[PDB]
């Protein structure tokens, strides 16, 4: 007698939100915000370098923990909390800027700068940088006077970047636990270090005095750095309290740097990383870590945003 | 809905219809029937599919660190960074909320439309041999067996053949 | 509008209708009448209400200072801050402009649709006892007193009762 | 004979804008951009601290104006234009960073560091920091030599944060209007201040010389600060030109800082503040001040954006 | 489309129609005709025009440098700047993609609607003197010469004049 | 017998994208992302200043190349790659901040500060800043001792901004290629420069030593700068290694600064500039240079985004 027509439905459909209504039940919906996580660093197919107890900046100066990282090469660079940039207590001026440089460097290639010395000491060491007992930073030279209190002869050294790429140059400045031990190394009187180039132009002076016994020392080393252009030339005018750069550093290519405390996994592939692991998703958004790096979904505040993929659900 | 069909005069949908999205349910001489319309169903499905693929999206844009979780950067620069990040979080949280709400509204109104497209098309086939009940059914004013029903479903039904008989039932 | 009703064939609206949004105005034996349709009116209203609540919005996201109005920060950092802020102002000024324009378009097309939903529904009740004038009126081909009009308004009107009489007026 | 149907209208409806048209008149619309203002700081229900003539940084060092604020506690902190961080002329290194810290500190709790001194002067004062005549910063010690030109014996003091939270440490450096008056206090010869810890590592040297007579003085005091971790230890190696920290500062909890020149009001409640008062609104946007802080509507360029809440208006 | 007209029952459009957007093509006594409907065409055009003007947009917001192409700024500040800029690029690349996709969907569904508005309006003129073929044509059940066709095109056609004759052809 | 109705179409329509589909062909579409370029600096109707071989910062100090720019006035300021801020080798502390100031300054007006000197030398020159042979920075004074090794008498000079607007003040510090040539000018012994005001408070010390021979010199000049408020006062306490400011600088009004290597053109008008020319467009977006300045379309990643302006295209 008649013919009827209609649509499908379900006893239990999912609630979504529209421009005009909240909690409208539809047939089939889907999640749009990623919350699922992988508690590992998915590094399948990538040249990875887990620094462990080596600090990123340490790969340039060369404390004991970084001896296996002095010329590393990577697509992915992982920093660990236990990593240390230093053996003898000290810091990097503009450390974060330098860290950010090294994270996308793709690794580093070292090259000797070629500095020879006329009548001073070089093999300066300490019980902090220990290998076979007292030693020093692998890439650095502890410049001293021949023996206690001897004069430090105002020297002048120089390096020229003979390569197509800019060179990372790093020197140090010694700050002694007292003006007493300062003289024991370089003698008394004002000591001055000046560094210049095309780009760069600045200078440095030591500041002896008693600091807390960190790592078994009251003294500190101030590491500094500049970015030397091709053909340009570095000049170190100094007379003590100076830590000489043996080798200059050159960037390899491209990479990414992350920070994490989870184990590395070469089984899974990922592009979006954060400190608690890897976010693998096709979803456009994520509610996990706002500081995630790499190729990531957009971080959003909402834990969930459901996208309707079915029609309106009118039940029986 | 905008098209007045789904949750409109069609008071509800058929949970028995596990066959497809839309379909015909008839009652005639032989009894009752219920089969799904692949054609209109696939159109809706192909459209919802289109949204999913265009939304599931990879930005080949790589972002690296500017913060530091192990060694906090200077407070001033640390605050500008946090300030910026939060501001952008606000934007994307907003965009995401709207985007989904906007799409969902459209998804619904699209399905409602696809139904109305089918109804208004059958009515065009029958022309004069039937009349609208109101709640989405065509009362046939002529005898229509099961093979007569199938003539409509595969879009072949001829109104001329049963024109005189059905018009007579005024 | 998209649905062709409001500012379409219904050449204009009734300023006399202070009763509701939509309504019926008839002319029969007893004279003329004009009452509002609560049902369809509330649907539109509930929908516009839905927009208002979802748009009137509090972000529990607290933002603090990074600038200083009493003691200007360093020029370089002061410029990056201003640069960032302006950029975000551009985004929100854009979003706001679009959002409102987008919603307004939808608000209008939603109301236009709600009218068309009512019209096409009455036409389904009357089936054969009336014909469309064009500008949104149903010319009745049978006698319909005031209580006959009220039978339609509360959705109870029976077409069978006056079928033979009205069909006769071909 | 017939039945007609239609919609409502009005002789005067409001113009809105759509995706496709400008100035389309509708039935009923509403404002979306807040412009209305409250010329007061709506602080109903909040622990408020109006600093007035006290500078925010002043609550740490303790000039006279900040004597009633040395241990404040707040949910809302208001800075005033007339507020001053200083009595004896001087500045804060990294002042804004510190201001931003204090604004969300929720107030401060002070604690003595416990420094005793062997044969020097302490009660150093000035006619600038006046209470009963010449006095000094409440939380600071003006370290001198016993009397004019006397030697300043190279001392060493130390403090350990024995609490679960980081401690705000602040010392000063005196810069004298001449090398003459410098010696009158600490004697001649180079004077040096070094400060270190786990995190921190740096040092300071005075710089005497004639400056403009600000506040009735040609000399300046350089206040510095660091953030000492739990269990960590501060060490001050010095020999003059030094302003000793009596008490260390500890953050209370959470708060918000604003800057304004309008009167406080505990009648009204607000979450969005700016210098000319409070923005109370449910509207998603606002065109009042782009630098508003708190829980605010989004600032936009437009003075107005009307949202249609009625249908298309077709008149008679 | 949403309205079921364009790429719906009207199986395709007329490449011969260089006259306008929409139009009537008839076949009667005198032969065949084909002319465009200015009225409905202009409505669609005025609407698409409206989009273009509102989208072609000048922001009187001036942005200046914070970078330096000749002498690179400090690496840290240089990275925050780049980081911010990229983030905003992401937002605008997103907004632009969506905006265009959103508008295009609406542009299409607007045109589809404008057709359906015309069809459903002609059907209202003819009332009883014709019936729907299905694929967007009105089979006239009464003789209609060229001047009878033109009576519809300029919206003047009277159904009463040919009512009795056409109804007779049941 | 019947009347049919439909829509238009074309044998070749354009593909666009919708919310639900990619590559849907429509009747007529249009481009939304600008890619077209003008390889010139469209400066029609604007007071333009092409600096050429003059560095922007150079217009303040006055090396030879900037002699024609010491008091410029502009709506549009163009920097060139070949431009140099310096004749005698040296740098600006906070150079970019200062560059950004000058770019929107609308030009500069100079004014003498009025410094007279009691028994020293002034006409200090060099073979670098050459005009008629050795000369110096036009706006600066090279302060010396009367002749070799003579004492540098601790002087004190001062300037007061007597104008409604803040004044740009610039002094220099000489860093000699050795402590030897340093004494040849100012004599031996520590030399100190201190500068203060309301806002400002700081000081400077020279740092002699051998640097690379840039421009034919091993010495460097450190230019510094501050922003002096109305009625406020600058004080220069010094005793050598000092480069005195002859004239103070005042900002004219408003302008825009750009950097480019394309030729200037007064035929075309533009508001959106970048280093390769001018972007003229009404289009809301652009895929040309992300660092474009002025009144620009929004930069986007996509090379193209087509906007449908016609209906769906269903062909025959
Ligand atoms: C090159 C040299 O002198 N090394 C010695 C140092 C330094 O003299 C001071 O540590 C400097 O601060 O002191 C030691 O106690 C140490 O740290 O192990 C012994 C070590 O042989
Ligand atoms: C501790 C001390 O010496 N206080 C004296 C100071 C300082 O010596 C110089 O001001 C330092 O610059 O000078 C005064 O004129 C002052 O400012 O009131 C007197 C005051 O008694
Ligand atoms: C005022 C003065 O002394 N000018 C002389 C300088 C400086 O003494 C040193 O260059 C300083 O570093 O040296 C010159 O060789 C030079 O640069 O042309 C000659 C010049 O007459
Ligand atoms: C619902 O939709 C998703 C994708 O949106 C689809 O993959 C899935 O088959 C559906 N889920 C269910 C339980 O039917
Ligand atoms: C830089 O180095 C290249 C070799 O790579 C050399 O040929 C060239 O002369 C140098 N250029 C300059 C400007 O010194
Ligand atoms: C910035 O935000 C993080 C959380 O994302 C917070 O832990 C940190 O303290 C903030 N950094 C600074 C410098 O305040
Ligand atoms: C930043 O913008 C404000 C206005 O919001 C302006 O008054 C101020 O001068 C700008 N700050 C800097 C550092 O230029
Ligand atoms: C119009 O709409 C607002 C909310 O959108 C409503 O509160 C109000 O009643 C209406 N205004 C008028 C004057 O009718
Ligand atoms: C830090 O302080 C706690 C007491 O709060 C103490 O028990 C603990 O030993 C200290 N930790 C370190 C690493 O010094
Ligand atoms: C920032 O991005 C530009 C390209 O826009 C790049 O060339 C430059 O190296 C980056 N700057 C820094 C400081 O890394
Ligand atoms: C298509 O549209 C543009 C504007 O959108 C219009 O100016 C032009 O006339 C049309 N182009 C063609 C080739 O018809
Ligand atoms: C500042 O300068 C004006 C002249 O422009 C002078 O009248 C006024 O006294 C000065 N104000 C102060 C606070 O020194």
Structural overview:
The complex is a heterohexamer, with three copies of chain A (316 residues) and three copies of chain B (170 residues). By secondary structure, chain A is mainly β. Chain A has two domains: 1-46 and 263-316, Hemagglutinin Chain A, Domain 2 (Hemagglutinin, Chain A, domain 2, Ribbon), CATH 2.10.77; 47-262, Haemagglutinin, alpha/beta domain, HA1 chain (Hemagglutinin (Ha1 Chain), Chain: A, domain 1), CATH 3.90.209.20. Chain A is 7% helix and 35% strand. Chain A contains three helices and 29 strands. In chain A, the strands form nine sheets. In chain A, strands 9, 10, 13, 15, 18, 20 and 21 form a seven-stranded mixed sheet that branches. Chain A is elongated, with a radius of gyration of 29 Å. With 170 residues, chain B is mainly alpha-helical. Chain B has one domain (1-170): Alpha-Beta Complex (Hemagglutinin Ectodomain, Chain B). In chain B, 49% of the residues lie in helices and 11% in strands. A two-stranded antiparallel sheet of chain B has the order 1-2. Chain B has a two-stranded antiparallel sheet with strand order 3-4. In chain B, a hairpin with a 4-residue loop joins β1 and β2 (32-36). In chain B, α1 runs antiparallel to α2 (75-126). Classes of the chains: A mainly beta (316), B mainly alpha (170). The interface between A and E is small, with 7 and 5 residues. Bound molecules: N-acetyl-alpha-neuraminic acid (3 copies) and 2-acetamido-2-deoxy-beta-D-glucopyranose (9 copies). One N-acetyl-alpha-neuraminic acid is lined by residues 124-128, 134, 142, 176-177, 181, 217, 219 of chain A. It is classed as viral protein. Keywords: homotrimer, virus attachment, membrane fusion, Viral Protein. It forms a hexameric assembly. The structure of hemagglutinin from a avian-origin H7N9 influenza virus (A/Shanghai/1/2013) in complex with human receptor analog 6'SLNLN. Chains A, D, F are hemagglutinin.
């Amino acid at each position: 007698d008649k013919i009827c027509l209609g649509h499908h439905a379900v006893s239990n459909g999912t609630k979504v939100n529209t421009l005009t209504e909240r909690g409208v039940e539809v047939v089939n919906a889907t999640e749009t915000v990623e919350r699922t996580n992988i508690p590992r660093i998915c590094s399948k197919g990538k040249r990875t370098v887990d620094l462990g107890q080596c600090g990123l900046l340490g790969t340039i100066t060369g404390p004991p923990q970084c001896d296996q990282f002095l010329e590393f090469s990577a697509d992915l660079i992982i920093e660990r909390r236990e990593g240390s940039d230093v053996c003898y207590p000290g810091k990097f001026v503009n450390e974060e800027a330098l860290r950010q440089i090294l994270r996308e460097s793709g690794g580093i290639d070292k090259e000797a700068m070629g500095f020879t010395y006329s009548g001073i000491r070089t093999n300066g060491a300490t019980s902090s940088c220990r290998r076979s007992g007292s030693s020093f930073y692998a890439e650095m030279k502890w410049l001293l006077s021949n023996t206690d209190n001897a004069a430090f002869p105002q020297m002048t050294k120089s390096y020229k970047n003979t390569r197509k790429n800019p060179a990372l140059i790093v020197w140090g400045i010694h700050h002694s636990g007292s003006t007493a031990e300062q003289t024991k190394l370089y003698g008394s009187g004002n000591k001055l270090v000046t560094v210049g180039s095309s780009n760069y132009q600045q200078s440095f002076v030591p500041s002896p005095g008693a600091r807390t016994q960190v790592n078994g020392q009251s003294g500190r080393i101030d590491f500094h750095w500049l970015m030397l252009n091709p053909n340009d030339t570095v000049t170190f005018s100094f007379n003590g309290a100076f830590i000489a750069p043996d080798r200059a550093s050159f960037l390899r290519g491209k990479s990414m740097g992350i920070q994490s405390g989870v184990q590395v996994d070469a089984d899974c592939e990922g592009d979006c990383y954060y400190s608690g692991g890897t976010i693998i998703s096709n979803l456009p958004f994520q509610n996990i870590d706002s500081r995630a790096v790499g190729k990531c979904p957009r971080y959003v505040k909402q834990r969930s945003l459901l996208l309707a993929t079915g029609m309106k659900n009118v039940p029986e | 809905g905008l098209f007045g069909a789904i949750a409109g005069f069609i008071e509800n949908g058929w949970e028995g219809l596990i066959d497809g999205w839309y379909g015909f349910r008839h009652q005639n001489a032989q009894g009752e029937g219920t089969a799904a319309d692949y054609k209109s169903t696939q159109s809706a499905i192909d459209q919802i599919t289109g949204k999913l693929n265009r939304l599931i999206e990879k930005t080949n844009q790589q972002f690296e660190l500017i913060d530091n979780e192990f060694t906090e950067v200077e407070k001033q620069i640390g605050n500008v960074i946090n300030w910026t990040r939060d501001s952008i979080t606000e934007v994307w949280s907003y965009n995401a909320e709207l985007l989904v709400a906007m799409e969902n509204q459209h998804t619904i109104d699209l399905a409602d439309s696809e139904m109305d497209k089918l109804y208004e098309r059958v009515k065009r086939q029958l022309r004069e041999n039937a009349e609208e009940d109101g709640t989405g059914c065509f009362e046939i004013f002529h005898k229509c067996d099961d093979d007569c029903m199938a003539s409509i479903r595969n879009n072949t039904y001829d109104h001329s053949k049963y024109r005189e008989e059905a018009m007579q039932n005024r």
